[PDB]
Design a protein around this ligand. Structure first.
Ligand code: CLA
Ligand code: CLA
Ligand code: CLA
Ligand code: CLA
Ligand SMILES: CC(C)=CCC/C(C)=C/CC/C(C)=C/CC/C(C)=C/CC/C(C)=C/CC/C(C)=C/CC/C(C)=C/CC/C(C)=C/CC/C(C)=C/CC1=CC(=O)C(C)=C(C)C1=O
Ligand SMILES: CCCCCCCCCCCCCCCCCC(=O)OC[C@H](CO[C@@H]1O[C@H](CO)[C@H](O)[C@H](O)[C@H]1O)OC(=O)CCCCCCCCCCCCCCCCC
Ligand SMILES: CCCCCCCCCCCCCCCCCC(=O)OC[C@H](CO[C@@H]1O[C@H](CO)[C@H](O)[C@H](O)[C@H]1O)OC(=O)CCCCCCCCCCCCCCCCC
Ligand SMILES: CCCCCCCCCCCCCCCC(=O)OC[C@H](COP(=O)(O)OC[C@@H](O)CO)OC(=O)CCCCCCCCCCCCCCC
Ligand SMILES: CCCCCCCCCCCCCCCC(=O)OC[C@H](COP(=O)(O)OC[C@@H](O)CO)OC(=O)CCCCCCCCCCCCCCC
Ligand SMILES: CC1=C(/C=C/C(C)=C/C=C/C(C)=C/C=C/C=C(C)/C=C/C=C(C)/C=C/C2=C(C)CCCC2(C)C)C(C)(C)CCC1
Ligand SMILES: CC1=C(/C=C/C(C)=C/C=C/C(C)=C/C=C/C=C(C)/C=C/C=C(C)/C=C/C2=C(C)CCCC2(C)C)C(C)(C)CCC1
Ligand SMILES: CC1=C(C)C(=O)C(CC[C@](C)(O)CCC[C@H](C)CCC[C@H](C)CCCC(C)C)=C(C)C1=O
Ligand SMILES: [Fe+2]
Lengths: 78, 199, 482, 35, 73, 44, 31, 38, 34, 31, 351
């Protein structure tokens, strides 16, 4: 009930035992997230070779509000 | 220019004649350095006094626009530091005034410190009344020194940053970034400024 | 020794002086309304209601009077261009005189209440000190406001006893004051449907009454009484400031974006109609239908009314203007006098060309004659610049259909260039520029001025709300007491 | 008729109610645990 | 001061309206009726959201058209 | 196309260096603040 | 006419500045 | 004409306030005159 | 001193975990041939 | 005489606040 | 009669909640915390996620992300396309229809960040009020923060609401803000508007006051320490002030001409300057939102058009604005589909 000082945890053994095996897991998770290609699929960012579609050779344009979903699906080539 | 330099000297002279400490001239050096840069060092680097700042308002605006056209000042780190210094000075002035006025009751630093420590965390940062005022005096002065040095360096024409065509996909095509739009604006500005065909 | 900005706080305790002060302010505002009505009526010119409506002459308060039923005038004219025979008591001049008389009576009442400040009505039986029962007073005032709202909704707007309100067709071509039957379905919530107004002024009205009754029969809880400092008279000030803040944004938004309570035929068109090609698209559809039905191009283009062509002109866009470009719109680009007609540009090859209309943002925009495929085919050099495609070279020619210049054609490059630069702004018009000495810079319609002023006031009132609420919550600290 | 947009709006209302209820339950439970 | 500096002026309208300005400071015990206020506030917020989305084209209803064209009913 | 050239060996090598440098300096920066907050607290 | 107005406004500003500099009330509150 | 109001103070304006007000009004006029005249 | 899962724990972890994840992501992005 | 309305606006803005402040100063200085 | 004081009734759930929320811990949650922490956290998270992964290829035709190869200065969270005029861009709204990938592609992340950030500012102001009430101090920090919140509200919500759509609001980034500044310099002549002039004066005066006050206080300290450094010759529990007001007053009354003689007035002036400057700037941008711009100086334009041989810096500024507009609108506004031939582009060679 006193919010133990940071020094106490700094010298603890369980703290280090947990963190030294946990943090590397997060780092590798991020590395695999952006390496396996999941980021492009998840966030819709096109790959370097997908910017210009075969039938389109210029920046896209939405030019539509209530059908923006189909417009974006067509422009992206998916 | 001579008058402002001798004003700088007179500040120290009077400070010494009264028993005060002599470090107000150091603070005043920032605006003096900036004025000296803009009015004397830029023309020397460029080679003519026509490149100085006209003594007016629209003249100052044209001055700024011509820099943004020629040297891309906005992306120079020193101008960023100057903007940061000015904004931080305004912030600190406003907030110091607010806390001091609130504390003064018909305690000056030990009362408002409790408020500040729990408002935005950051306990025991400026608990000494002297360190706080020194920080106030130091931030904007350093910012202005850096921006003046940046203008002086631009006088000898290195440049601001340049990220034009920094992103390219496969096959060699170029994808535009915001820097490219800034560069288009600068290109139009520069083309408009130059007369070239002069009769 | 009160400073200059704490002077009026001397009235913060005695209610009688507060009553007198509020009466004085009410009298001032009523007098302003009357004086502006008289001035605007003195400056108004009712000759031409097509090419010289109210919104071209910088009128501000006249449309508000016209929006609720006031049409005729004592001079014999009407806002619709006809002639009045029986103006009656209720006309523009009558309304102005009534407002002035009200201002004077309120001033006399104000001075009376200022003289007699100590009345028994302002002292409670217990503790013998001045006090106001704020919850019960609020109940009474809310009851009255709700009753008035119901009356207005069910007697004036609906037309069962009153004249009604202004209703017009979508394109602002034929409008007038009519009764408005209520609409209860989901179609009663879109602000472009007039019915949704009347229903509201009924429904909410009833609720108002009910609310007031409650507020007159149930005392507030102790915890709420002390939490909101309901015994003080500055909390109510903060609440009222916040309410007017909110209302200012509501009204400004509805004026800018257009609604059924701000017809385009009284305040002028909005910028979003120019941006989306509303009137242009309507005219094109009508002309195409006329051609399909079978008729000559001149006949098809000679049937559209002049008002519809007037609405499609960028000079009427409220967006384009200046903060310091003072005066009415009629003093910016001259008073309109006629419609030349639709200008069609055709090059030597034979394909028709169209001029790229100027967007709202651009203060100055180059003229670009481009055909139906969207590819530029002619244009004018910036200023004495090298030319590859030019009006002189491509040799485009302009023909006029309908309007005054019906059936004429031009080939001189100077005239073609002039008419292209004129058409880039929209429908070509004729402007008399020698009466008002118009400079040549566009001005904003009443819509923009209203929105700007009320938004600025709303922000300042937000600051006022913050300040007064802070000074109410921190009463003891501010006063330097326990 | 119930258009899909209206269904999505009612779903959003339900989600907001759920979030507010969750926050209220969290504060209540923690306060009861500590007092 | 005595009774806040002696009694004030008395007028027929003042006597008539005195009852409406007598019980100043009276309150109910506990929280009274705050829960009803909370429920009504929530309902009003829902109504405001509905109208805001209707006028912003984020909630398209079958009957409403949301354009100037509705003036030609 | 858009794959990562470097292998996972460097991934783990850098993970070890950038994971045990941030989990041991996050309490050292906050220690002054937590030590002074208690002094400020329970006093006024 | 505009030039005279501008000159008058500038002269007035300078005059107020001078009067504030030289005819200020003494600062005896704290000194 | 009924009874003197106990709540009646008098406004006070020291010289520094007057100088500040004059400076403010003159500076605003200097800034805005050109725009007003166009 | 004994109890855990306090406000401070949640506050620090919430900004700590995503920071490490994004640092790993950016470090991986660095080694892309484009 | 160009922009008579502008000249009147400038004169009023320069006179009314100035007169108000000066009257206030003379009134208070009597204390 | 039955009188009553304060808190003389049975305890309730509200009492327990209030007791827990207003404790003394490393982080002060308070009632305003419930609104501040989630909103601010989500705003920051959204900004970082947008700047790291999401792109603006389908809205502006740009590439702005670390995954696409952008620096800290060029990455940003771009605004939604102009077709989405003023839609709030909910994930469940008619535009996205519940698809997260398409929601990110269309640009609803900007609206997410903006709305949650505005509510975070409101929560922060309420937090300041709560702290001030708890520790019994007058709330001046509330107004000092009311200035920047007003500026943010104006720029990021009222300006787009008057224009075509969200497309013209600032994009959260550095190069985006530079583009915004140049865009106003080109189209509105924002530098000539008096309100920005007043704001500039206010900000520069605030910096000047900060610097001068710091220098004067640090150069007039009393001798209350043997050590060469004056920082350790002080404790928070001091009785008197650490600097001589009389000496500084005389110094600045002999150098400049006018000097302060009241601490409260001095610090209140410090508070007053920047707030007024930023408020005036906010009013100026509010005016600009309706295209009510100070651009004309009609007399100068008429005189210049009458005869070419009359040039002032104002005319040169007008020409520079024309150049900016003509040369930047080509790619700044893709939805307009503008193609200016090189013949028509303004250039100084043709004057
Ligand atoms: C919000 C309320 C409002 C609105 C929207 C309008 C709108 C309008 N009025 Mg009305 N008017 C109003 C209130 C309002 N007025 C009031 C309260 C009065 C009583 C004085 C008048 C008296 C009045 C007259 C007598 C006339 C108008 C006219 C006009 C039209 C011309 C544009 C204009 O106002 O000038 C442009 C506005 C400005 C130049 C003001 C700029 C605003 C800045 C922010 C003020 C800055 C002040 C600054 C701090 C100090 C500067 C000092 C400097 C002068 C030295 C327009 C339709 C004219 C018209 O067309 O009638 C046919 C006209 O002749 N009005
Ligand atoms: C319903 C509206 C309302 C009401 C009844 C009050 C009433 C009051 N206010 Mg509040 N206030 C309001 C709105 C309101 N205010 C708003 C919107 C703001 C934000 C700008 C403020 C900001 C404010 C501050 C900062 C302070 C007050 C103070 C006061 C008190 C003294 C009046 C004063 O300033 O001295 C009289 C003022 C003058 C004689 C100066 C008038 C000169 C003005 C600035 C220019 C001319 C105005 C023009 C002729 C008319 C404009 C009309 C426009 C509103 C449409 C009084 C109880 C003061 C107080 O006692 O609190 C401690 C105080 O310090 N108010
Ligand atoms: C206090 C914290 C807080 C606040 C103020 C907001 C505020 C906001 N969020 Mg955020 N959000 C939060 C927490 C918060 N959120 C959390 C914790 C999450 C994670 C789960 C999210 C996830 C999130 C997403 C993913 C999105 C938002 C969005 C929004 C905006 C739309 C609000 C809306 O319509 O939602 C719903 C609001 C309500 C329903 C209001 C409550 C009214 C209740 C339900 C009344 C109920 C009474 C009664 C039963 C109704 C009767 C009618 C009918 C049922 C018969 C708004 C700015 C959206 C946005 O604008 O992004 C662009 C968006 O896309 N938020
Ligand atoms: C001497 C040069 C100069 C100076 C000093 C100024 C001064 C100013 N200009 Mg600029 N301007 C100039 C020249 C200059 N101008 C020129 C030549 C141009 C070209 C036309 C412009 C174009 C321009 C534009 C387009 C705008 C300005 C604006 C402003 C004002 C900025 C107000 C502010 O701080 O808002 C910035 C502060 C905020 C928005 C508050 C947000 C704070 C949030 C809550 C913090 C978020 C938390 C964060 C994540 C924490 C991280 C902290 C970390 C960074 C350490 C200020 C008065 C702006 C303005 O005020 O307009 C109203 C504006 O929009 N100016
Ligand atoms: C022909 C001619 C004449 C040519 C002139 C042409 C021309 C261009 C004219 C000028 C036009 C002109 C006036 C333009 C400016 C117009 C303009 C933009 C006005 C802005 C006005 C406005 C309302 C802005 C809002 C913001 C605002 C209020 C800003 C205030 C700015 C301001 C006054 C800043 C303070 C400046 C200043 C020097 C302060 C120093 C204070 C000082 C002496 C402190 C010293 C000090 C420190 C201590 O620590 C202690 C302890 C003591 C004791 C002490 O003393
Ligand atoms: C000070 C306040 C501090 C706290 C504020 C915190 C933020 C509050 C939460 C965010 C609110 C955002 C509201 C968005 C409203 C909106 O986008 O409506 C957008 C729509 C308008 O929508 C437009 O309509 C036009 C006319 O047909 C065109 O069709 C346009 O294409 C269409 O986009 O307006 C509304 O539905 C609501 C109007 C009422 C609100 C007005 C607000 C102020 C308007 C100012 C106008 C310029 C001056
Ligand atoms: C001191 C008193 C004067 C103060 C300045 C007044 C304003 C400038 C007047 C300049 C002038 O000459 O106007 C001159 C104009 C009249 O202008 C004349 O009008 C004629 C009409 O037939 C013709 O069009 C003439 O050509 C034209 O010159 O007078 C007015 O503008 C009066 C209306 C004042 C403005 C009301 C709208 C305000 C909207 C914003 C309100 C909120 C602002 C919040 C800011 C914070
Ligand atoms: C449910 C959790 C998530 C939603 C919470 C929303 C906030 C609601 C509580 C606000 C309390 C503010 C306290 C300020 C800080 C404070 O301490 O204030 C105190 C003040 C009065 O407190 P007392 O004088 O009783 O306090 C006595 C002692 O504790 C003082 O030390 O509380 C109120 O005025 C309550 C007003 C409620 C009015 C709103 C009613 C509900 C509206 C609808 C809510 C819908 C969502 C549910
Ligand atoms: C109860 C929610 C629990 C948390 C859910 C997960 C949250 C994280 C979401 C990440 C994005 C993933 C996509 C979700 C989006 C999604 O997949 O929605 C989909 C869902 C249903 O749409 P459908 O896919 O059925 O629509 C398909 C077609 O029929 C559309 O025409 O939409 C809703 O009903 C609303 C859901 C709100 C979900 C957000 C919860 C927060 C609501 C706002 C709270 C405001 C509080 C204000 C307090 C004052
Ligand atoms: C007593 C009486 C009478 C008469 C009366 C009268 C005739 C009155 C009048 C009155 C009037 C005739 C009034 C007026 C008023 C006015 C006003 C009150 C105004 C105001 C204004 C303002 C306030 C403004 C403001 C502004 C401006 C300027 C613009 C914008 C900005 C601002 C907002 C600042 C008789 C014998 C018959 C009978 C018995 C009773
Ligand atoms: C998804 C999403 C969400 C949420 C989110 C979040 C919540 C996020 C967060 C996020 C985060 C939380 C992030 C973070 C990040 C971080 C970072 C990214 C960092 C970085 C750093 C750096 C980069 C550094 C650098 C440096 C230093 C400082 C040291 C040394 C030096 C140098 C300079 C190198 C939701 C569902 C609601 C909705 C939708 C969207
Ligand atoms: C003594 C004691 C303390 C001091 C304590 O912190 C806790 C943990 C409660 C909680 C998990 O923090 C509950 C947090 C939930 C919170 C109510 C959600 C809404 C408010 C914020 C979103 C919380 C995060 C704020 C943080 C980011 C500063 C318990 C159980 C204890 O017994
Ligand atoms: Fe200080």
């Amino acid at each position: 009930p006193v919010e133990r000082p940071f020094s106490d945890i700094l010298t603890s053994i369980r703290y280090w035992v947990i963190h030294s095996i946990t943090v590397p897991a997060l780092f590798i998770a991020g590395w695999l997230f952006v390496s396996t290609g999941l980021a492009y699929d998840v966030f819709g960012t096109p790959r370097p070779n997908e910017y210009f579609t075969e039938d389109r050779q210029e920046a896209p344009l939405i030019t539509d509000r209530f059908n923006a979903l189909e417009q974006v699906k067509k422009l992206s080539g998916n | 220019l001579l008058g402002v330099y001798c004003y700088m000297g007179r500040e120290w002279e009077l400070s010494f004649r009264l028993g005060m400490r002599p470090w107000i001239a150091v603070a005043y050096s920032a605006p003096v350095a900036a004025a000296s840069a803009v009015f004397l060092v830029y023309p020397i680097g460029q080679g003519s006094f026509s490149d100085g700042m006209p003594l007016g308002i629209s003249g100052t605006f044209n001055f700024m626009i011509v820099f943004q056209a020629e040297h891309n000042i906005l992306m120079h780190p020193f101008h960023m530091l100057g903007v940061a210094g000015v904004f931080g000075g305004s912030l600190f002035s406003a907030m110091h005034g607010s806390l001091v006025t609130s504390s003064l009751i018909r305690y000056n630093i030990v009362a408002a410190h409790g408020y500040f420590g729990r408002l935005i965390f950051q306990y025991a940062s400026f608990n000494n009344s002297r360190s706080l005022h020194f920080f106030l005096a130091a931030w904007p002065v350093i910012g202005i020194w850096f921006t003046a040095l940046g203008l002086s360096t631009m006088a000898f024409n290195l440049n601001g940053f340049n990220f034009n065509q920094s992103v390219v996909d496969s096959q060699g095509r170029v994808l535009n970034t915001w820097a490219d739009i800034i560069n288009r604006a600068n290109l139009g500005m520069e083309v408009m400024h130059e007369r070239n065909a002069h009769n | 020794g009160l400073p200059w900005y704490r002077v009026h706080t001397v009235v913060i305790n005695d209610p009688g002086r507060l009553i007198s002060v509020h009466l004085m302010h009410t009298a001032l505002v009523s007098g302003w309304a009357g004086s502006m009505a008289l001035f605007e009526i003195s400056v108004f010119d009712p000759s031409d209601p097509v090419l010289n409506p109210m919104w071209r002459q910088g009128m501000f308060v006249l449309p508000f009077m016209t929006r609720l039923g006031i049409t005729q005038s004592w001079g014999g004219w009407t806002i619709s261009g006809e002639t009045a025979t029986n103006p009656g008591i209720w006309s523009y001049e009558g309304v102005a005189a009534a407002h002035i008389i009200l201002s004077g009576a309120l001033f006399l009442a104000s001075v009376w209440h200022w003289t007699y400040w100590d009345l028994e009505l302002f002292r409670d039986p217990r503790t013998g000190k001045t006090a106001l029962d704020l919850p019960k007073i609020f109940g009474i005032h809310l009851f009255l406001s709700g009753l008035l709202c119901f009356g207005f909704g069910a007697f004036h707007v609906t037309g069962v006893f009153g004249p009604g309100i202004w209703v017009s067709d979508p394109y602002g071509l034929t409008g007038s004051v009519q009764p408005v039957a209520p609409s209860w379905g989901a179609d009663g919530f879109d602000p472009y449907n007039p019915g949704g107004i009347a229903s509201h002024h009924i429904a909410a009205g009833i609720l108002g009454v009910l609310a007031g009754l409650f507020h007159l029969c149930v005392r507030p809880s102790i915890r709420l009484y002390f939490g909101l400092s309901m015994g003080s008279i500055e909390t109510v000030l903060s609440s009222s400031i916040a309410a007017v803040f909110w209302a200012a944004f509501v009204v400004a938004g509805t004026m800018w974006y257009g609604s059924a309570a701000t017809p385009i035929e009284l305040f002028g068109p909005t910028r979003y109609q120019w941006d989306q090609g509303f009137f242009q698209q309507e005219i094109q559809k009508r002309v195409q239908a006329s051609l399909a039905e079978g008729a000559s191009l001149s006949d098809a283009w000679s049937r559209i009314p002049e008002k519809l062509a007037f609405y499609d002109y960028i000079g009427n866009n409220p967006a384009k203007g200046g903060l310091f470009r003072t005066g009415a719109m009629n003093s910016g680009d001259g008073i309109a006098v006629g419609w030349l007609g639709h200008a069609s540009f055709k090059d030597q090859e034979g394909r028709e060309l169209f001029v790229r209309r100027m967007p709202t943002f651009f203060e100055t925009f180059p003229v670009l004659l481009l055909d139906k495929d969207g590819i530029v085919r002619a244009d004018v050099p910036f200023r004495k610049a090298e030319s590859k495609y030019s009006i002189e070279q491509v040799g485009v020619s302009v023909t006029f259909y309908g309007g005054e210049l019906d059936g004429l054609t031009f080939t001189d490059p100077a005239t073609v260039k002039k008419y292209a630069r004129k058409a880039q702004l929209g429908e070509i018009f004729e402007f008399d520029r020698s009466t008002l000495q118009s400079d040549g810079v566009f001005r904003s319609s009443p819509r923009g001025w209203f929105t700007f002023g009320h938004v600025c006031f709303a922000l300042l009132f937000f600051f006022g709300h913050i300040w007064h609420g802070a000074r109410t919550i921190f009463r003891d600290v501010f006063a330097g007491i326990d | 008729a119930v258009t899909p947009s209206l269904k999505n709006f009612l779903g959003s209302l339900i989600a907001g109610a759920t979030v507010l209820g969750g926050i209220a339950l969290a504060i209540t439970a923690v306060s009861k645990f500590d007092k | 001061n005595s009774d806040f500096q002696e009694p004030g002026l008395v007028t027929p309208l003042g006597t008539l309206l005195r009852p409406l300005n007598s019980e100043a400071g009276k309150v109910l015990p506990g929280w009274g009726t705050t829960v009803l206020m909370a429920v009504f506030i929530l309902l009003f917020a829902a109504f405001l959201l509905i109208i805001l989305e209707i006028y912003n084209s984020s909630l398209i209803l079958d009957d409403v058209s949301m354009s100037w064209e509705t003036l030609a009913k | 196309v858009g794959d990562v050239n470097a292998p996972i060996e460097y991934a783990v090598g850098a993970a070890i260096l950038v994971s045990l440098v941030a989990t041991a300096i996050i309490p050292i920066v906050l220690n002054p603040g937590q030590q002074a907050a208690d002094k400020i607290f329970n006093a006024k | 006419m505009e030039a005279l107005v501008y000159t008058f406004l500038l002269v007035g500003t300078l005059g107020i500045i001078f009067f504030s500099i030289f005819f200020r009330d003494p600062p005896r509150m704290i000194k | 004409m009924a009874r003197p109001n106990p709540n009646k103070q008098v406004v006070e304006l020291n010289r520094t306030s007057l100088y500040w007000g004059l400076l403010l009004i003159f500076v605003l006029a200097v800034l805005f005159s050109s725009y007003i005249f166009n | 001193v004994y109890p855990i899962f306090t406000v401070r724990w949640l506050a620090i972890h919430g900004i700590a975990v995503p920071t490490i994840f994004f640092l790993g992501a950016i470090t991986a992005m660095q080694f892309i041939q484009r | 005489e160009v922009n008579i309305y502008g000249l009147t606006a400038t004169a009023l803005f320069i006179i009314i606040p100035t007169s108000f402040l000066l009257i206030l100063y003379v009134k208070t200085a009597s204390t | 009669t039955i009188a009553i004081g304060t808190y003389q009734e049975k305890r309730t759930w509200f009492d327990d909640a209030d007791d827990w929320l207003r404790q003394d811990r490393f982080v002060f949650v308070g009632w305003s915390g419930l609104l501040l922490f989630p909103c601010a956290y989500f705003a920051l998270g959204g900004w970082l996620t947008g700047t790291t992964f999401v792109t603006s290829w389908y809205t502006h035709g740009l590439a702005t992300s670390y995954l696409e190869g952008c620096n800290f200065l060029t990455a940003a969270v771009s605004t939604p396309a102009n077709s989405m005029a003023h839609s709030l861009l909910f994930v469940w709204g008619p535009e996205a229809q519940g698809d997260f990938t398409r929601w990110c592609q269309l640009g609803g992340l900007w609206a997410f960040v903006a709305l949650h950030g505005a509510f975070g500012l409101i929560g922060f102001m309420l937090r300041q009020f709560e702290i001030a009430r708890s520790v019994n101090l007058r709330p001046y920090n509330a107004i000092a923060f009311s200035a920047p919140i007003a500026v943010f509200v104006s720029v990021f919500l009222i300006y787009p609401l008057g224009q075509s759509g969200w497309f013209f609001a600032p994009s959260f980034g550095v190069a985006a803000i530079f583009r915004f500044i140049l865009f106003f310099q080109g189209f509105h002549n924002w530098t000539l508007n008096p309100f920005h002039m007043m704001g500039v004066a206010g900000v520069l005066g605030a910096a000047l006051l900060c610097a001068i006050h710091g220098a004067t206080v640090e150069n007039t300290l009393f001798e209350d320490g043997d050590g060469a450094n004056t920082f350790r010759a002080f404790n928070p529990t001091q009785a008197e002030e650490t600097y001589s007001m009389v000496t500084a007053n005389r110094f600045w009354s002999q150098i400049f001409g006018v000097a302060f003689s009241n601490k409260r007035w001095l610090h209140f002036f410090m508070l007053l300057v920047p707030v007024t400057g930023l408020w005036m700037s906010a009013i100026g941008v509010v005016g600009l939102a309706l295209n009510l711009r100070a651009y004309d100086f009609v007399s100068q334009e008429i005189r210049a058009a009458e005869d070419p041989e009359f040039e002032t810096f104002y005319t040169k500024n007008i020409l520079l604005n024309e150049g900016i507009r003509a040369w930047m609108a080509a790619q700044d506004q893709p939805h307009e589909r503008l193609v200016f031939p090189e013949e028509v582009l303004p250039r100084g060679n043709a004057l």
